[PDB]
């Protein structure tokens, strides 16, 4: 849309949006991210702290599957199953607990986040944080680990 952009409205002004004095040439501060410590220090400080140096252990050839663990915290603990069973199996004729597993829903770890409701469930995951299991064991549900 060259009708809409700037250079039509500026076409006729001499210096073309760049000033008489400075007179925009090509590269007055060097090409790229030049001048890290020398003469653009105040730009790299105050907007990018931490850019200069080592911090940690080198780790040759990590493979992004060994440390793969997704998290459902307990807000989303009932989006896994249908709404059809969070009320149909909510009737305490006896301890009719539904199971909920997350490793068929693409999740490995169950973390904690507030308001697990008052239905006793059995929740299957490979890892439970100890706030999450004490929200399941304090609504009368059990927390069955699986692999």
């Amino acid at each position: 849309p060259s009708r809409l952009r700037k250079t039509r409205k500026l076409r006729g002004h001499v210096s073309h949006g760049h000033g008489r004095i400075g007179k925009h040439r090509k590269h007055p501060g060097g090409r790229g991210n030049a001048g890290g410590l020398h003469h653009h220090r105040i730009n790299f400080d105050k907007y990018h702290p931490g850019y200069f140096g080592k911090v940690g252990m080198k780790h040759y050839h990590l493979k992004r599957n060994q440390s793969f663990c997704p998290t459902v915290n307990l807000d989303k603990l009932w989006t896994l199953v249908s709404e059809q069973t969070r009320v149909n199996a909510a009737k305490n004729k006896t301890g009719a607990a539904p199971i909920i597993d997350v490793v068929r829903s693409g999740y490995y770890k169950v973390l904690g986040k507030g308001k697990l409701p008052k239905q006793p469930v059995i929740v299957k995951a490979k890892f439970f944080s100890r706030r999450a299991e004490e929200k399941i064991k304090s609504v009368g549900g059990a927390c069955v680990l699986v692999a």
């Binding site: 501060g29 090409r31 907007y47 599957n65 607990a97 439970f128 549900g141 059990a142 680990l145």
Partner: protein, 205 residues
């Protein structure tokens, strides 16, 4: 060259890049070229299906992906051995063979042995001149269609257990917890050392 707050950028155009560029102005032309090589191939051969052989069921390599099922390469002989067909007979019947594939489970082995005989159940052959060595009558009353599509026996079938509902018992609601992992990990990095501290008690003499 940088100004007020922004990303720091390493754009990889310092190298010469305008002499290797690849516009895909032929990717519609390459799609309807390789549909002619599926139209005029699947009709040219046979009532044999398109999309190749029967592939077996294969479970993925990454911890990330071991929970799922994939169309693998070939039934690795053993599945040709428990089901009992000859290996060089198998790849003209329409059964893929991958000899460098191993089986270190009995759970996964019978998961393809039933699959292979199920393929051999839904197979009909054409004997040459109708003396019929070990094929039945007229051609399964007819071939019923010309070609099959997108895989023989639907190689995904990512099935899952129902596991309907249960009563929480006494043992299940007291034990199996987070502290059963912190001591489980503590028998992973404090196990070899405790083999060595018991050698200290066998040299205490």
């Amino acid at each position: 060259a940088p100004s007020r707050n922004g990303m720091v950028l390493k754009p990889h155009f310092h190298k010469d890049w305008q002499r290797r560029v690849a516009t895909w102005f032929n990717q519609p032309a390459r799609k309807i070229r390789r549909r002619k090589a599926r139209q005029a191939k699947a009709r040219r051969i046979a009532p044999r299906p398109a999309s190749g052989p029967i592939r077996p069921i294969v479970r993925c390599p990454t911890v990330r992906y071991h929970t799922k099922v994939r169309a693998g390469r070939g039934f690795s002989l053993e599945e040709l051995r428990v089901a009992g067909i000859h290996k060089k007979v198998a790849r003209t019947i329409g059964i893929s063979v991958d000899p460098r594939r191993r089986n270190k489970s009995t759970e996964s082995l019978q998961a393809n042995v039933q699959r292979l005989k199920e393929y051999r159940s839904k197979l009909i052959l054409f004997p040459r001149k109708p003396s019929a060595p070990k094929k039945g009558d007229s051609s399964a009353e007819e071939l019923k269609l010309a070609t099959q599509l997108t895989g023989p026996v639907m190689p995904v079938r990512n099935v899952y257990k129902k596991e309907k509902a249960r009563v929480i018992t006494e043992e299940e609601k007291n034990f199996k917890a987070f502290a059963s992992l912190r001591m489980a990990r503590a028998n992973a990095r404090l196990f070899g050392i405790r083999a060595k501290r018991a050698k200290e008690a066998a040299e205490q003499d």
